[PDB]
A paper describes a structure:
To investigate the substrate recognition and catalytic mechanism of JMJ13, we determined the crystal structure of JMJ13CD in complex with the α-KG analog N-oxalylglycine (NOG) and an H3K27me3 peptide, at 2.6 Å resolution. Overall the structure closely resembles the JMJ13-α-KG complex with a root-mean-square deviation (RMSD) of 0.49 Å. The peptide can be traced from H3A24 to H3A31. The peptide binds in a negatively charged cleft with the residues H3K27me3 to H3P30 located at the bottom of the cleft and the other flanking residues extending out from the cleft. The side chain of H3K27me3 inserts into a deep binding pocket within the active site cleft. An NOG molecule and a Ni2+ ion are deeply buried in the center of the active site. The interactions between JMJ13 and the H3K27me3 peptide are restricted to the region between H3R26 and H3P30. H3R26 forms salt bridge and hydrogen bonding interactions with Asp236 of JMJ13. H3P30 positions its side chain prolyl ring such that the plane of the propyl ring is parallel with and stacks on top of the phenyl ring of Phe179 of JMJ13, resulting in hydrophobic stacking and CH-π interactions. Compared with the JMJ13 peptide-free structure, the side chain of Phe179 undergoes a significant rotation to allow stacking with H3P30, indicative of a peptide binding-induced conformational change.
Here we investigate the role of histone demethylases in plant flowering through the analysis of Arabidopsis JMJ13, which we show possesses H3K27me3 site-specific demethylase activity in vitro and in vivo. The recombinant expressed JMJ13 catalytic domain (JMJ13CD, residues 90–578) displayed unambiguous demethylation activity against H3K27me3 peptides, but not H3K4me3, H3K9me3, or H3K36me3 peptides, confirming that JMJ13 is an H3K27me3 site-specific histone demethylase. JMJ13 has a central catalytic domain flanked by flexible regions on both N- and C-termini. Our genetic studies suggest that JMJ13 acts as a flowering repressor, which modulates flowering time in a temperature- and photoperiod-dependent manner.
Author numbering:
A (entry chain A): 93 to 563
B (entry chain B): 24 to 31
The structure:
Amino acid sequence: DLKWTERLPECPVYRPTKEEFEDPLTYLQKIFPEASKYGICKIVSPLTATVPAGAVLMKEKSNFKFTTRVQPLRLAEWDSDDKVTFFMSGRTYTFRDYEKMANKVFARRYCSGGSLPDSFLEKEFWKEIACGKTETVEYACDVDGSAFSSAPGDPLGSSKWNLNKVSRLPKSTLRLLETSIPGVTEPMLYIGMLFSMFAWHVEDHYLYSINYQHCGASKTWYGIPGSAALKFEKVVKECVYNDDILSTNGEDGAFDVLLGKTTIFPPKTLLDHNVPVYKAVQKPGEFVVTFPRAYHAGFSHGFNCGEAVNFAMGDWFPFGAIASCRYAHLNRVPLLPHEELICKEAMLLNSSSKSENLDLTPTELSGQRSIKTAFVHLIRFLHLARWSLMKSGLCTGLVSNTYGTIVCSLCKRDCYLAFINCECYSHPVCLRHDVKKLDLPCGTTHTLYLRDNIEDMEAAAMKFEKEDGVS
Amino acid sequence: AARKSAPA
Ligand SMILES: O=C(O)CNC(=O)C(=O)O
Ligand code: NI
Ligand SMILES: [Zn+2]
Ligand SMILES: [Zn+2]
């Protein structure tokens, strides 16, 4: 029927002034207590680029080209083999040529290539999915490159809103990151065409996402509140159980695996089972932020170019925890060194300047509280694990741990404070495992690798645990 | 490896 599209509630739109703009993390700090509730929000940039994105790509960068990927929008269920073969059949284009091709296919569909009204193209996307005869769209996802100008004059490029600068911003908890991560530490370019889509995802680590549209047609996002995440996944399986918008129906998967086989489904089904959905229609010059654990999907209305990066502030730390456990439960190597980030942030808060942590926003305060809580819980657990270990008498060696984060060979959880190493060095395990029941081919001698400064961190934990709101 | 995600 598609009337639901017209009556979807829109997400909050903020239009700060230049003086309000500051940097995106402080701004998100300020607006968090309301936008948080929606999972998705939109910020109109009060700063214009002096050099537009096509010009920055053509002149500031040399021979910029990119390869595309082919998505099947909606068709008799595509099996994994057929899927994988055509995902990267896509040809390599030049910005100008991808634009030209997309606008030709758009003209072909609607006799003219002029942008069309948003309600029209959205209804068209959902009806095309339901019964369209077109098979595929080309989308240049995940391109490494940036359309912000390196020019010093450019007000947007020289601002702290440039995606290139965000991960190293003072309130970016990933500023502490050791090594770069594509899309996480550094932005990526997304270049779309008519009906090129991004299906429902919760991101990596429930981390925040920030996306800026540089140019082109509108982009429609559907966002779910972090609050609704469980309900979201619940309904999906039920409705995949119902054979409503049915997938391949394997019925033996982790949740993203199931999502990765479904034809993208309309928000109406989500509204029918009473899970909140908000719409954002993103134009050039607008940032869309997705909040940690906020599910979102979306599609393009035509040729367009956007730029996105994932980030974290301290309020994200509880969500990170949840992701970690799921990562472990699904026995998957985590994206981020969670424990290391807890420790580094917490010991930066410990030994603070203290001339800073006085009058500050409630959301930052809550994030600091969440960092301290994560730190205190981690140190208490590791203390009792170490006590148990010592009394077992199965731990032969103790070694000052000088490494970065390592991955436990059984669960796959990140280990920063401590791990138990073996004889060959290929079966280290986190302290969550009963060492008596370790059956390792290398032997039985177990060596505890422990961070050198554990005493300082224990003192920090005992300081924090007496502090207000950290119980 | 360190990265974001999709099917190749
Ligand atoms: O812009 C796109 O193609 C999709 N964006 C995202 O998934 C995001 O930034 O959260
Ligand atoms: Ni996303
Ligand atoms: Zn483990
Ligand atoms: Zn071994």
